[PDB]
């Protein structure tokens, strides 16, 4: 039930900030985005040891662009997902963890 | 018709060399790759330069990874195309 996922990211308004990685499953791609926030949160000095989903949302809003292309086993093609869908999936994953 | 196309490129074996751009149509994305080959050919000799079809292909094999994701209006999804498909289309556009 794992589907190849391409994660597209543009970190800054600059076009040369467009980078990408691919993952074995959508869950892996969502986990990678959470790890990115945790790395970013680590750099903050003097902060609470707990973080809320709202902060994860704020980190994703800092990205100029974030989207996913998820392989659909039925069609053989990739379904595109944008930031709002990604936020919801991250919320569901965190609430279940 | 015009179909949203994402061009994925990895220039070196390093994973952090993975970059991408998107275009309004497959033709634009294919044209960009040809622009890239011509730019690369310029710096090698710094002279007027002619190239063979094999050299055109070789530039695409020199990239660690190149692929395209082409939006299909009928399916509403993106078709993945890999290097072999791109090489064929780049040649046809060149011809």
């Amino acid at each position: 039930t794992s589907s190849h996922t391409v994660l597209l990211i543009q970190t800054s308004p600059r076009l040369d900030s467009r980078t990408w990685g691919d993952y074995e499953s959508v869950t892996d791609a969502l986990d990678a985005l959470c790890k990115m926030f945790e790395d970013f949160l680590s750099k903050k000095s003097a902060a609470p040891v707990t973080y809320d989903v709202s902060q994860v949302y704020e980190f994703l809003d800092k990205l100029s662009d974030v989207s996913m292309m998820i392989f659909n086993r039925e069609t053989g093609q990739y379904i595109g997902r944008t930031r709002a869908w990604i936020k919801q999936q991250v919320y569901e994953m965190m609430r279940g963890r | 018709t015009s179909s949203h196309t994402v061009l994925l490129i990895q220039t070196s074996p390093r994973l952090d060399s993975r970059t991408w751009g998107d275009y309004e149509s497959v033709t634009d994305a294919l044209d960009a790759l040809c622009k890239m080959f011509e730019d690369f050919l310029s710096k090698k000799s710094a002279a007027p330069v002619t190239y063979d079809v094999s050299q055109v292909y070789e530039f695409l094999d020199k990239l660690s990874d190149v692929s395209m994701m082409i939006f299909n209006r009928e399916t509403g999804q993106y078709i993945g195309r890999t290097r072999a498909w791109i090489k064929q289309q780049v040649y046809e556009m060149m011809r």
């Binding site: 800054s12 990685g21 750099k43 | -």
Partner: peptide
């Protein structure tokens, strides 16, 4: 923080070995 800090965090996780 700035955009480079954002890029560093993205690159660290996305392009890890």
């Amino acid at each position: 923080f700035n955009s480079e800090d954002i890029k560093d965090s993205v690159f660290k996780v996305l392009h890890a070995e």
